[PDB]
Structures are given as C-alpha cells and as structure tokens.
Amino acid sequence: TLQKKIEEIAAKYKHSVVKKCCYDGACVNNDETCEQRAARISLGPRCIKAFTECCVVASQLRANISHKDMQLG
Amino acid sequence: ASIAQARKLVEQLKMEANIDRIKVSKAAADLMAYCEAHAKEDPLLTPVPASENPFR
Amino acid sequence: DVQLVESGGGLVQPGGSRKLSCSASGFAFSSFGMHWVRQAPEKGLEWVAYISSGSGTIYYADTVKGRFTISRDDPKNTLFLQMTSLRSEDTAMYYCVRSIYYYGSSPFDFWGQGTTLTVSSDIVMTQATSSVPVTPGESVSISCRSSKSLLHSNGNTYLYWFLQRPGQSPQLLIYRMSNLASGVPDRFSGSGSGTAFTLTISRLEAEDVGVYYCMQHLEYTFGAGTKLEL
Amino acid sequence: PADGIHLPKRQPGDVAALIIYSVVFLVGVPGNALVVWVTAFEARRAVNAIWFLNLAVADLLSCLALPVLFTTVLNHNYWYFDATACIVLPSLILLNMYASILLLATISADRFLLVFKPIWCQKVRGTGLAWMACGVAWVLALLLTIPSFVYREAYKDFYSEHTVCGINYGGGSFPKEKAVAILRLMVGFVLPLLTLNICYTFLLLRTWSRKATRSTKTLKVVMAVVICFFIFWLPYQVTGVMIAWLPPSSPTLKRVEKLNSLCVSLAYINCCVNPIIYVMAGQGFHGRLLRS
Amino acid sequence: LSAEERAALERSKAIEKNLKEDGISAAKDVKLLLLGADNSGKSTIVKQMKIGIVETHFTFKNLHFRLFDVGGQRSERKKWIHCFEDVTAIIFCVDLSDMHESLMLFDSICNNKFFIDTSIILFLNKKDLFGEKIKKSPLTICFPEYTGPNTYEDAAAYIQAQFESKNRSPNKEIYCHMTCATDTNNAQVIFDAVTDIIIANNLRGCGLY
Amino acid sequence: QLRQEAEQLKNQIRDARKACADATLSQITNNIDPVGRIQMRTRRTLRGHLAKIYAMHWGTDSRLLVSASQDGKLIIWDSYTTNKVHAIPLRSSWVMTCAYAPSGNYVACGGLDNICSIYNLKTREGNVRVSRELAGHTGYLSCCRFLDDNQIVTSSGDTTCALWDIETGQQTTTFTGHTGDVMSLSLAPDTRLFVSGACDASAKLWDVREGMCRQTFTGHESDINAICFFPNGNAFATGSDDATCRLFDLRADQELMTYSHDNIICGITSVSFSKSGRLLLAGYDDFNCNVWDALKADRAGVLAGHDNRVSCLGVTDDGMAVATGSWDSFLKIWN
C-alpha cells in the first residue's frame, strides 16, 4: 500500500539516482532506528534529504502493519 | 524288601550280557556307509536350488 | 452329523423379492465359508453367492451382482441370501453349499436339500457328452473341459467333481481333481491336467446312476452335466 | 552505480545457533531412526512401545525438517522457498513439536496411571486406547497449529533480495495476535509443563513409599527429563510472549526477535533427548536393537 | 499371484485376531507359583481361595489370580521348575510346627537361576499351634545355632531371619507373613505384593525401574 | 552275594564292551571330508505365539507343523505360507511335548498334567476335537511319538514309558528300567523298537512288542534331555545337561562319540538328525542351536537366531528344513 506513496514521494527527485535513493531506503527490515544507516551512507544533498523521509515513512508503514517475524512461532 | 528288585536287575543285566555284540569297527563302518549313501538326498547338508526350495 | 436345510422358496410374482435362509446344524458354522448355488429344473448348476468366514469377504454372480445379497448370522447358525427383483431366469432349486478353506481342506464337502423358487474372462466348463449308457461292473471315463487352465503355479489344480443322484442333493467325489473326498468309496478316481480332465470309475453299481458335474474353483462355474444310466 | 554498498549483516549471537541446530540434527536423527525401528510394528504388539513410537516419529519428522530452518537462519531469516511452503513447512514443524510436547505430557500421564491405577490398567490398557490418546494429542497439536496454517504469509516491499516467512495480524481492534500468544503459551507449554511436573512428582511420591517399587532411577530419569524440558522450553515461550506483547513500535524487540531463533534451537534439544532417556532407562534395549 | 488361497489367508488372519484377543485376556491375570514342602499349607492356601499340577484360580479386587500348585508332583524339580519362570510371584510357604527340608528348598528356589529376580511371598504358615510348640518344645533342637530366648515373638523373628538370609542378590524382595491358621487376609497380602510387582514391571517396561 | 552278583555282571559286561571296542570313530573318520562351514538362514518365522515354546513336530507331508507353548495354544502352522491352519486351546497350558501323526490325521500334546491329549484334525465338523485322553502316568509327560494312527508311546517323569492303544486308551505295553525320570523318546524308522533318555544319565533301548530292554547305555555325567534315532535305526544320539551330546550304537552296545566343546557350559534342550544323518542338530540353553557332524563331532555352524532359550527342534521328513522353536515365542524354519 505504501509502495505507491514511496514512489510518488521519490517522484520529487530530479535525477535517476535521486529517484533510486528511496528505491532501497523503503526497506521494511526488522532493525530499529535506521537513522544510523542513513548517516552511514554518502550521497548528494537531494538524496541525503530524501533518504530520511523515505525511511521514516517506510518504518511507520512497517510498524502499523503489525508484521512480526516468527520462525516456529 | 529289595531282594526281588535286585534279582530282576541281575536277570536283566545277564540278558543284556548274553546278547550278541559286534565290534565297533563294523557299526562305525555301517554308519559311515549309510551317511555316504544318502549324501546326495539331503537339502540341509547340501545346497538346494531356489526352484525346488519349498521355503523360497 | 452335518445338515443344511433351507427355507424361503415357493411362488413369487414377477419383479418380486424375498430372502432365503440356510439353517445349519451339526458343525461349527462360524469357521465355514458357506456358499449358495442353484439348479434350474432342466439345466446345469450355476454359481450364485459366496460369503467367507466372519463375513469378511463376499462375491456374487455376474447375472446377480448388485441384485441379490448374502448374509451370515453366526450365533444362530443361519445363512441368509436375500434376492431382489426376481426375473424369469432366476427360477431354480437353491442349494446351500458348505465350505472351509485351508491347506488340504475339502471345499464344497456338503450340500443342502434345496428349496424351489418359481416365477411366472469368465471361465466356462463344457462337457462333450450329456448321457452315456453304463452297466454294473464295467468301467467308464467321464470327462469335462475348461476354457482356462486350472493348474495354478503352486501345483494345485482347482477342479471338483460332483454326482447328482435322481431326487437327491449333489455330493462331493473328488476335490482338487485328485483327492477323493471322505465318505466316498475308492472306486472313483480323478485324473487330467491343464485344460483337459476326466473321471475314471470302475466297478459301477446302481448307486452311481446320476449326473456328473465338474466345477472350477481357481477364480470367481459348473459344467453341463453327464447322465449315467443302464 | 550497479551496486551501492553491501554487507553480510551483523550476524548476532542468535545466528550462531546453527551449531546447535547441526548438533541436534546429527545426534537426534540416528537415535530417532534406531528408536523408531525398535518401536516399529515389530514391537507395536506392546502398548508401551506405541507411545515411544509416536514420540519418536514426531521427533524424527521434526528433525527431517531441521534443514529448512537451519537454512533460513543461516540466510538471516530470509525464506528461500515457495510462498505456499511458508504456510506449511514451519507449520509442519510446529505441528510435530507440539505433538511431541503433548506426547511427553501423555507419556507422563500414562506412567502416572500405570503407578496410581495398576488395577484399572490392564482393563482398558491396550493398543486401541494408546492410539486413541496419541490421536487426541495429534489433534490438539493440529488445533494449536491451525492459527499458523491460516495466518502465515511472506510479505516484503522494495527488498527484492530478501523475503521473510513472518506472520501478519492486520485487522480490527480484536487481539488477533495476543489471543494466539496466550492460547499457544497456555495450552502448549504451561499445561504440559504443569502436568509433567505434577505427574512425575506424584509418581515418585507413590513409588518411593512401599520399599519395593522404590528406586533411584525412577527419580533420576524424571528429574533429567523435567530439567531438560524446563530449561529448553521456558526461553522459547517467554520469547514468544515478549514478541507479542511488545508494541510494534518496539523499544527492545530487535533483540528478542533474534533470541527467538536461539530459543527454538534450545527447545530442539528436548525432543532430541527423549530417545536418549528411553534407551538409557529401558530394560537393556540391546537385544531389541539387533534382534530386529 | 494368489489363488483362492486368499480364503486360507483370511482364516489365518482370523486365527491371528482370536489369538491376540485371547492373549490380551490372558495377560490380565496374575500368575502365582504356589510352593512349599508337603503339608506346609499350600492346600490350606488354595482352600482359602474359596473355590500333577493343579492351577487353582480366584479373583479378588479386580485382579484374576491363578495359583499353580506344583507340590503334588514327585519328580526332579530341576527339569520342570523352568515351566514357572516369568510368573508374577511365588507363594512359597513353610510350616512352623515342623523344617530343615523347608530351609533347603527355600535356599534352592529363592536362589534358583530362574527366580533370581522374581519376588517371593514367604508365608510362615501354622502360627497358632507353633505358638504352643514353642512352649512345649524348645526351638534350640530345631536350630542348634539359635542364640536367643524361648519367648514366642523372638523365636518367630529368628525363623524369619534364617529364612530371609538365603537371598544372594540385591534386585529381589521377600515378603514374609504369618498365615495364623485363620487366613481371610492372605488375599490382601498377596494383592499388595503383586500390586508392587506389577507396578515394578510397568516401571521396567517404561524404564522407571 | 546278590550285590556281588550284580557287580560281577556289570564288570563282565564292561569287559565284553572293551573287547568289542577294537576302534573308535575318531580314528576311522580320518579320511572323511568334513561338511565344511554350514551357513544357514531363517526362511520362515512363525510369530503367532505369545509365551515360551517347549515343543514342536513337523509333519510327514513336510508342510505342516505343530507347536506347543505356554500360551495354551497348540497351533498347526503352514510352513510354506505361514498361515495358522488350526488353533487348539489346551485344557492345560503346561505343555512340553507335542506330536504330529504320520498320516497327519491326528496330533498329540501333553505336559505337567500327566495326560497325553490326542486331537482329531480331519474332523467332519470342521473344528479340531480331542479324540481321547491318555492317562495313567504318575509323572509329568515329557515326550510322545506316534507309531501309527492308533499306537503311540509316551515318555514320562516317573522313570517309565508306556505304549498306548488310542482306540481303547489303555497301556498295551508299559516300560520300566530307568532309575531317573525320562525326558525324551524317539522311534526307529522300522518302528519295531525305540529308546528313551532319562535324568539318570542312561539311555536304553526297548522293544515295542514285549517291553524288554535290549541294550542299556551309560557314560553321561548328568541328566539326559533329548534323543533322536539315526536315520537307519542302528544308532542314536543323546542330549544332556552337561553341555555334551553322545552317540550310542545298538549293535556295538556302547557309546561311540561324545559331542563336547569347552565354549559351551549349558545343557542341550532338544536334538534331531538330518535326512542323511550327517548333521546332528542340538538345541542349547545359551540362546543358540549348534550343528554337529555326527561322524566327526565338528561344530559346522551355529543356528543363533533366538532371543531366549531354544527348546524344541525338528527336521523335515523330506530333509528340506529344520524348525527350532524357543522361549522367544517365535519359531524359525531354516535351510
């Protein structure tokens, strides 16, 4: 459901790499506080600004969906 | 009384003694010959084919 | 002594239905896989039903499958054969047949008195002659043929011989085509192999006058019948 | 570029449970294979062998499914199988393991009845009652695993290089996940642990009274099995409860979710050690091992 | 393939079913080897059951007991005592009003190669008139090694110790009891002993003993 | 005097026996090729029994067996198909002997009940029925073999043997002369004279017609458990508790071989020969059955396949197979 929202948010970019900046930042991994990953990467100001907005909404979507990992659970 | 029982025992022993006996060299040879004669007619002592085996 | 008396016959309107009972006595009915076979007034015997010991296995005839049903009530020692939708081809005298199955056993070793019922890949047994003349003290050979070989791979040949005295019930003479059944004189004998069979009788008497049928027991079938007379 | 950056992830300490998985597999599959053969149709004429046959076959089915979970935990919870497999294979493992737990519970109940009701047994004791009780245990395991047969699904987005075999509870305000957590916790571990401990405690307090049935082995084997059960099953269930009652906006679930795999690896050892206890406690178990 | 011999196979399966049912019914019973010297009290014990080898049987408190009295056979016991291996227990009894033959027999059988792990329910029968024999006839003549008083309870305890000393293994138990010539309770004693024995066998089958 | 007469008679019997013993079988079998290593495997397993099995007996048709067991069931087996063609509930489950009639029409069984039960198989009614009960022994029944469909001879635990007329059930000829109780009994192929083995370490030959002992053999150290005639009827082997079997010859009237090996310290339960008589098959207490080359006393193989004491043993009249029951409640048929 949030994939289309992520795509339309990334549509604000002006470059192919700027558009793909959120193509990988929209992950729904079970790790917490992705801000460390956002600070770890290196990119231009456009992708730097877009990565935080992409990952915050990705985390919110992954949180409100109540998806819980259960190997034998 | 035990005299009658002993008399029966000695009579039976005398009957056994008077019975003829052959030397062991004859009885053993006869046993060996009988074993050799039926050597080819024993599925236990000789291998048996599965075709003729009643327990195959 | 062994007895088998049936009941439930008589007159039936066409399209009707009724059940026949085989009251058994004088033997341990619980371990016997009783049958039920019939004879038309002017035809040979034919297989109808078969129920195993403990009612664990049951078969019917092709002209009867899905039409009749066979039931066994062991505690009361009675064999039931319920017949449904009777037709013009079902009128006959029905003989309850006793049988027990183990190695060296004699199946079909006893037969009932019979009850008349009147209305208003298969192996076939053939007999080359319907009647031959016989004289006391002579020797005759009665033969019948089968469409399929009755000799199984284990060496047994499943052919049986029966004699039908006039006004009496059939009695077993030879079972598995070689072993003469108990209570029969040694005068009778059986021989043959493969698809051809014959019954050798010597020193005949008046007690041998009757019709000789042969039955195959290899697979789920009587012959025509050969009559002996002076 | 064609690739920005890649890492082998953090491989937390719970990922190192693959050593436990492999050890349990290698020491359980041959033992299970031999005990299922000993308790096979050859010994099925005896009532006692039926319980151990059922427990052994449950454990052996669980052990034959160890490669799947070993692969997914070495793949960092990435499900490398079919989507329809994500709803059946881990569900099959859950079914077999809850069947094993309830089979331990029913074996404890049977050994409790053999001690407390010696005369009531041998009257209803038999193959039929044993198979009925085992079937009831398997049916209860099926009921406990149905909420996994009809609610497991692999879902991800913008992560085409991974896919996890998680569980979803999307819906209304009804406790879709908390009801499952409490029901599973209670019926599958709390009642089994309680009945195991209580049955064995009463069994020992009855056997150590008449000086004839008294034996130190009766205490030793039950103490070993109860200790193993508790130590290997408490972490799994406590982690399962924590993974449910913690909010999705979780403060500390990032560690508990990883620890769940280690708890499962620990819980495997209990199913593994039941054949060991059976062969080390039986009446020699040597002739039946070769005369088969 | 199989011929009409499928009916023979069906008969074999029916025989198997009947045999399994009969064996399940038979295992419900408790097998007891009643034993002892002549006039020791085996006849009194089977009389209290209220009913070659004579297999006296009775049922009590939902258990079916079968007493295999083999004391009426005058033959070498080393050739047929193995027929009674794998019984629930032995109801060996002695007569206090005798004696050395009973002790020798108990040493031979209590330590027999077939009964080395089979519980023995030793019944020191004939308590009432032994209570008079101890007063009329000193027990020192029966046991020259008896270093004790001629009072009743201690003499009974000395006989108990002499009988119980014959065990050579730590994996078997001996349930000594006194029949007191009135009985009406030996059923309960045998029931408790066989209950312990069957519980122990269940534990062994389950690995608990 | 009379004791001195008995001693003198025994001494002269021994002297005559020594004179007749010009050689032993060991020094004459120096040129016989041994049977080699006999490798035998179980071909059938009869697992319908529920307790210890003490006795078995093949049939002259070489297809059907009879087994006696503690379960109280005397079940006739189909050795080729494994079917249980019959199942007889015993009046007493304490059975150590069983017999199959040479015609196959009858079957005998007995034990601690002092009664030999004759069961009619070819019954008109279809179920196995007892024909008559053989009573009169004061000791337990140990072995019994049929002469025909009407004459049977039974060993007992009262040091006596008896030959029975099944039509009347009386003792046509009673046998006395053993000092210890008798364990085994086997018949000659000519069926004119038989032997019996008793716990007094003596095996002696009897006449069926008159009951007079014809040759009494001694030499064993312990109780005799089993005897089987050699296929010619001129010799027989004995089984004893002393872990040794010994061969006795009727014409030589003395022992001829002793089957011993130090590794065995347990008694022999049952013994029987093969069709050729070369193989002597003895059941042992240590869970296994050995095969003995009767001409060389060699241990040519071990029939170790039972979890408990192997107790009974019989060999096909066709020589095809040997079946050894045991306390493991399972029979096994070998080739």
Could you characterize the architecture of this molecule?
The complex is a heterohexamer of chains A (73), B (56), C (230), D (292), E (209) and F (335). Chain C has two domains: 3-119, Immunoglobulins (Immunoglobulin-like, Sandwich); 126-229, Sandwich (Immunoglobulin-like), CATH 2.60.40. Chain C is 0% helix and 46% strand. Chain C is built from no helices and 21 strands. Chain C has strands at residues 3-7, 10-12, 18-25, 35-39, 45-51, 58-60, 68-73, 78-83, 92-98, 110-111, 115-119, 125-126, 131-133, 139-146, 159-164, 171-175, 179-180, 188-193, 196-202, 211-216, 226-229. In chain C, the strands form four sheets. In chain C, strands 2, 4, 5, 6, 9, 10 and 11 form a seven-stranded mixed beta sheet that branches. A six-stranded mixed beta sheet of chain C has the order 13-21-20-15-16-17, with no helix packed on it. In chain C, strands 1-3-8-7 form a four-stranded antiparallel beta sheet, with no helix packed on it. In chain C, a hairpin with a 5-residue loop joins strand 4 (35-39) and strand 5 (45-51). Chain C starts with a strand and ends with a strand. Chain D is mostly helical. Chain D has a single domain (13-290), classed as Rhopdopsin 7-helix transmembrane proteins. In chain D, helix 1 (18-38) runs antiparallel to helix 2 (47-64), helix 1 runs parallel beside helix 8 and helix 4 packs parallel to helix 6. Chain E is of the alpha/beta class and 209 residues long. Chain E has one domain: P-loop containing nucleotide triphosphate hydrolases (Rossmann fold), CATH 3.40.50.300. Chain E has six helices and seven strands. In chain E, the strands form two sheets. A four-stranded mixed beta sheet of chain E has the order 2-3-1-4. In chain E, strands 5-6-7 form a three-stranded parallel beta sheet, with no helix packed on it. In chain E, strand 2 (54-60) and strand 3 (63-69) form a beta hairpin. The longest helix of chain E is centred in the first third of the chain and has 22 residues, at 6-27. The relative contact order of chain E is 0.14. Chain F is mainly beta and 335 residues long. Chain F has a single domain, classed as YVTN repeat-like/Quinoprotein amine dehydrogenase (Methylamine Dehydrogenase, Chain H, 7 Propeller). The radius of gyration of chain F is 19 Å and the shape is globular.
Query: What is the succession of H and E elements of chain B?
Result: HH
Number of helical elements of chain E: 6
Which sequence of SSEs, written as H and E, runs from N to C of chain E?
A: HEHEEEEHEHHEH
Helical percentage of chain B: 40-55%
Name the CATH superfamily classification of chain E: P-loop containing nucleotide triphosphate hydrolases
In the CATH hierarchy, the third-tier topology of chain E is known as: Rossmann fold
- Specify Rg of chain B, calculated over alpha carbons: 23 Å
Helix vs. strand class of chain B: mainly alpha
Query: What is the CATH third-level topology name of chain B?
Result: G Protein Gi Gamma 2
From the spread of the alpha carbons, the general shape of chain E counts as: elongated
Record field, number of beta strands of chain E = 7
Q: For this structure, what is the CATH homologous superfamily of chain B?
A: Transducin (heterotrimeric G protein), gamma chain
Quaternary assembly: heterohexamer
**Distance from first to last alpha carbon of chain E:** 49 Å
- Class by alpha and beta content of chain E: alpha/beta
Terminal CA distance of chain B reads 63 Å
Helix content of chain E: 25-40%
**Total number of distinct structural domains of chain E:** 1
Identify the strand order in the major beta sheet of chain E: 2-3-1-4
Strand content of chain B: under 5%
Number of helices of chain B: 2
Region (G5 motif) (chain E): 179-184
Binding site for Mg(2+) (chain E): 43
Enzyme class (chain E): hydrolase
Main location (chain E): membrane
